[PDB]
Design a protein around this ligand. Sequence first.
Ligand SMILES: CCCCCCCCCCCCCCCCCC(=O)OC[C@H](COP(=O)(O)OC[C@H](N)C(=O)O)OC(=O)CCCCCCCCCCCCCCCCC
Ligand SMILES: CCCCCCCCCCCCCCCCCC(=O)OC[C@H](COP(=O)(O)OC[C@H](N)C(=O)O)OC(=O)CCCCCCCCCCCCCCCCC
Ligand SMILES: CCCCCCCCCCCCCCCCCC(=O)OC[C@H](COP(=O)(O)OC[C@H](N)C(=O)O)OC(=O)CCCCCCCCCCCCCCCCC
Ligand SMILES: Nc1ncnc2c1ncn2[C@@H]1O[C@H](COP(=O)(O)OP(=O)(O)OP(=O)(O)O)[C@@H](O)[C@H]1O
Ligand SMILES: Nc1ncnc2c1ncn2[C@@H]1O[C@H](COP(=O)(O)OP(=O)(O)OP(=O)(O)O)[C@@H](O)[C@H]1O
Ligand SMILES: Nc1ncnc2c1ncn2[C@@H]1O[C@H](COP(=O)(O)OP(=O)(O)OP(=O)(O)O)[C@@H](O)[C@H]1O
Ligand SMILES: [K+]
Ligand SMILES: [K+]
Ligand SMILES: [K+]
Lengths: 335, 335, 335
Amino acid sequence: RLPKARFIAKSGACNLAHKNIREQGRFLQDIFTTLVDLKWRHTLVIFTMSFLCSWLLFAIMWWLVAFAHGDIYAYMEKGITEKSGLESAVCVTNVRSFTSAFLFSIEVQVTIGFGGRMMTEECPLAITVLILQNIVGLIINAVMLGCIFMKTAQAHRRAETLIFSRHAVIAVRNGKLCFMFRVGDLRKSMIISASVRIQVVKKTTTPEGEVVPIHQQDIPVDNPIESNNIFLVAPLIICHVIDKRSPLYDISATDLVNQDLEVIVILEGVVETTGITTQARTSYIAEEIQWGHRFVSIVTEEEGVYSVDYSKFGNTVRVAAPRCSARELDEKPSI
Amino acid sequence: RLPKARFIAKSGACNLAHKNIREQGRFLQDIFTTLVDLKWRHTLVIFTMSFLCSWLLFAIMWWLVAFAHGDIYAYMEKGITEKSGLESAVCVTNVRSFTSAFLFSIEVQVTIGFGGRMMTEECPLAITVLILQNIVGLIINAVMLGCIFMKTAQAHRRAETLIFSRHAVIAVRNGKLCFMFRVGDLRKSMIISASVRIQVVKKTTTPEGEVVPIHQQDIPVDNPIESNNIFLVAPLIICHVIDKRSPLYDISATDLVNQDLEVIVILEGVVETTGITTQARTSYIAEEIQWGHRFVSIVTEEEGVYSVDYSKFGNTVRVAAPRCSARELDEKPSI
Amino acid sequence: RLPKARFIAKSGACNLAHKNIREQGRFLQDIFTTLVDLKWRHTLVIFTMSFLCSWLLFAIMWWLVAFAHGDIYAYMEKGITEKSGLESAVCVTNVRSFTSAFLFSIEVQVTIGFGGRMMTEECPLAITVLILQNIVGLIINAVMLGCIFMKTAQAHRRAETLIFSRHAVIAVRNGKLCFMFRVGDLRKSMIISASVRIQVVKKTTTPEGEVVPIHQQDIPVDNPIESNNIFLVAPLIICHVIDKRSPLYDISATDLVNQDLEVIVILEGVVETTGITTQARTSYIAEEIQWGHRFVSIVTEEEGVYSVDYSKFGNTVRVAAPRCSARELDEKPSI
Ligand SMILES: CCCCCCCCCCCCCCCCCC(=O)OC[C@H](COP(=O)(O)OC[C@H](N)C(=O)O)OC(=O)CCCCCCCCCCCCCCCCC
Ligand SMILES: CCCCCCCCCCCCCCCCCC(=O)OC[C@H](COP(=O)(O)OC[C@H](N)C(=O)O)OC(=O)CCCCCCCCCCCCCCCCC
Ligand SMILES: CCCCCCCCCCCCCCCCCC(=O)OC[C@H](COP(=O)(O)OC[C@H](N)C(=O)O)OC(=O)CCCCCCCCCCCCCCCCC
Ligand SMILES: Nc1ncnc2c1ncn2[C@@H]1O[C@H](COP(=O)(O)OP(=O)(O)OP(=O)(O)O)[C@@H](O)[C@H]1O
Ligand SMILES: Nc1ncnc2c1ncn2[C@@H]1O[C@H](COP(=O)(O)OP(=O)(O)OP(=O)(O)O)[C@@H](O)[C@H]1O
Ligand SMILES: Nc1ncnc2c1ncn2[C@@H]1O[C@H](COP(=O)(O)OP(=O)(O)OP(=O)(O)O)[C@@H](O)[C@H]1O
Ligand SMILES: [K+]
Ligand SMILES: [K+]
Ligand SMILES: [K+]
């Protein structure tokens, strides 16, 4: 049938819609913020076109300011007839075409300055254009260096190397029921101050009328000293003991076929080397909760040092377990 | 008359005045910190003016040293005479006017160095000025590039995108009279490790006369596992259960209007993308607190997906609730 | 025989061996990331080689374009003819060899532009090569500055500086057995917001048959207000008191030699100078726990100041202690 309403997909990225938000309006900072955060394949194109366009723009300007003053006419007539007169005190020496203007703009903008096409002092308009081009070039160059430095500072970024298990299992641990899943780390560095949270999403109904459509009740992670902190080195099993205070206290095996259950798992912490905090998410719906399974053991020391066999990360071995809601299991103990 | 003196405006900014603080003065570091943080409308202006003024200043120096050494007179006479006589070993070739001096300064500080106005081995004051100009140009260049790198790093920085409702409410949940409001977000990245702290700012009175005028009293947010943290994707209803420890345990509907209440809401977290901690604040006073109203349900399920209608963000309906102080209901629910 | 497998060695660096991981693809981003994090001995080499290779490559290009055109022939026949028959026909003036091509490439790419080898405006192919060289030089220059900027930024951080004692003790402190070790710091700065966590790695079996290879159990460190936060200026003695739920409850004094134990200590914090969160780890096994000892005092008052004496950091003196398991000292109280 048409897929259900899933609060967050199997890889985070909540499938929500945010409509009717008041339009704050398009800004001029959208362009810049996009420019700073681009892909290399397009950064190295805007970088090239910025130059290749500024050179051309100021080339057109120099070609004009050498057309108006009559410089092209001097270098076209006296260059044939008589070399004397210094070409009648042109604005810029030896600019006599559009290739000349283009090369002069390239020199003044890159700051090569060969010196064959030298700026004279015989017209202030040229001095104006030279000042303009120097300032424009400095600004463009500073901005492009900034972009490349930003791309360099974000070079260690990767995807989320935290992995989960597609199946979450309900089983019996230390006498009671337990909802459990597995989590594992692929990155070489050990995240610092890791933490886990678990939330059941439902549609609650208070006695007095309220109906919160997606109410995210929170669930306590099972742990000896009642904390959230975990030490992720080898893949490990996060558990939750379904007692009289958990919204799964009235969930049985037969009911777990059509059920308004969705368990959100949020794991976050600071990475040791890079130093930027990360958050990973996953979700399980009544399809991926299998009643009466358990996870296999993985670690084993073949010779000396231990070894984690990741080939069986999400495995699940069928086991024998009750078939009644956790409420029954204490309503009729010792059965 | 004047409204009762708030503590933090509903916008979020503090209103207190810090008067009579031993002055430390204004350092020189303020003039640089203010420079690294300017609007582009002014960053570009100072970027232009720094270079323009430096070029003009060192042009003045070059013109002066081309005067004092008797180099302008030699060029003017050689123009008056027939032959230049190698300008008789000038300080700096082909600098015969102020304009030429400006061009030479532009070439020396942008490092264009066309090379028609060279620099000779004659007078060492020229070499001293050249060293000064080189070092000053390098320092100014480095500073401007640093400021532009700062801008390109602060590209992502914006204002607060967190949203608190216009006015809180006080309703009945599970037979308990509790105070609740709504918080939401217009951002895109989930705030990593949010935390919601609530306080009551009220004038206390110790029995031994330790009167405090603005007393900040922490209040505990309702949570099934007793922690502040919240996962914020869709808009949430923050709530506070009024009980024996709650300062609001005496407030009635009719006595609400004439109360010196103020409830301060602080919300902290880390932005996943930009990685910089934030903080939002808001305040409620006895006018905003709507007694007896409760909010409306935003999220709706449709097209097999959830959807949030941000047009109803602040809507609140009136529902029939006890019109008596919390202590009245709690002491004698029916007696 | 072979040393028994460990979990975390005496210097952190978990000694596990993850295998069978579903290996991903190798991306060029890995090459760039390796480039951006390097050792100065290699940063300098890659920096130098980039520029040498680029100068040489474009020297080859310029020499080829001086060969294909009639340039080398013209400048070789001009010397014979003793007349400048090659002033304007040349693709790039005064480039008549490979050494001169190399000099011209250096001038164009470092932006010196001496001007003895000028860029003529005849051959369009040369103009194409010049534009290409300028763009490539700009890109390489920006990349290398970005690498140096990253080096400068992450320059401040250095290696670990937390000192842990070689082996622990099990004393009696305030009428109960306590497992103690000593942690000190050699750094000059302050670990802001430090924290201590203790775990027991051991192979556990459940009544239902779920066997966990290396289970990590959380140990409540002993603090008078039940918190982790430790303030570290003078070396501290971290202690844990063996109560009804500690896994070290039933381990006696005689059979501590052969017992599957391992105590992992993880100490986290935030340094003040650079604000880079750090985590330091260590582990103790059965062979390195000395029953009935206690650490000697280290700090003596010199009547002007206290004076820690780190020479005795790991010293530990033998004292009396009930030579029996922690269960017998309360189930058999008389002892
Ligand atoms: C000769 C000796 C020189 C030696 C230099 C060595 C020292 C420098 C270090 C090497 C780096 C050189 C600079 C390039 C840096 C980019 C390389 C690499 O890091 O990027 C990889 C790019 C593609 O990445 P992406 O699409 O953004 O992926 C998103 C992100 N990376 C992610 O996965 O999360 O993939 C690519 O980068 C593909 C590049 C193909 C095309 C390259 C040329 C483009 C520029 C062309 C400009 C010159 C010509 C233009 C004008 C011509 C006019 C005639
Ligand atoms: C010749 C080009 C041909 C070839 C094309 C080359 C392409 C160029 C690539 C690199 C561009 C370099 C400049 C980019 C500027 C982007 C900055 C812009 O997006 O910021 C917005 C500015 C004004 O916003 P703000 O509120 O004051 O500050 C932003 C604040 N942080 C905020 O978020 O809210 O909005 C503005 O943009 C300010 C406009 C009004 C400024 C008034 C006059 C400026 C002073 C004098 C001009 C100086 C010369 C400028 C040269 C620019 C050309 C490179
Ligand atoms: C007249 C001068 C006045 C101006 C001076 C003022 C300052 C401006 C210049 C600043 C100099 C640059 C700063 C360098 C900082 C020194 C860093 C130093 O640690 O590295 C020197 C190396 C040490 O190697 P390392 O252990 O890997 O270091 C990284 C460290 N482990 C880390 O924490 O990460 O030590 C070694 O172990 C030696 C091994 C080789 C290292 C160098 C190799 C040289 C290669 C090429 C260099 C020559 C360049 C020119 C070549 C031209 C070719 C024609
Ligand atoms: N569609 C929306 N888009 C963006 N922000 C919104 C939207 N709806 C409400 N808000 C935010 O909600 C806050 C107030 O919400 P509420 O609807 O309770 O206010 P109100 O009583 O309607 O008064 P106002 O006229 O300020 O909205 C404001 O700060 C506003 O920024
Ligand atoms: N060897 C591995 N390397 C990296 N990631 C893994 C590996 N094995 C499993 N995973 C991750 O664990 C999850 C397992 O879910 P999946 O849909 O792959 O079930 P599966 O293929 O039956 O698992 P398995 O084959 O490991 O039993 C996937 O998200 C995957 O990313
Ligand atoms: N005075 C000190 N200065 C610097 N580091 C020390 C000092 N004393 C001990 N350490 C560090 O503390 C660690 C634990 O040493 P401990 O005192 O427990 O045994 P030890 O007898 O010092 O062993 P070793 O002789 O190998 O250091 C050692 O690895 C050492 O690096
Ligand atoms: K940074
Ligand atoms: K230069
Ligand atoms: K030059």
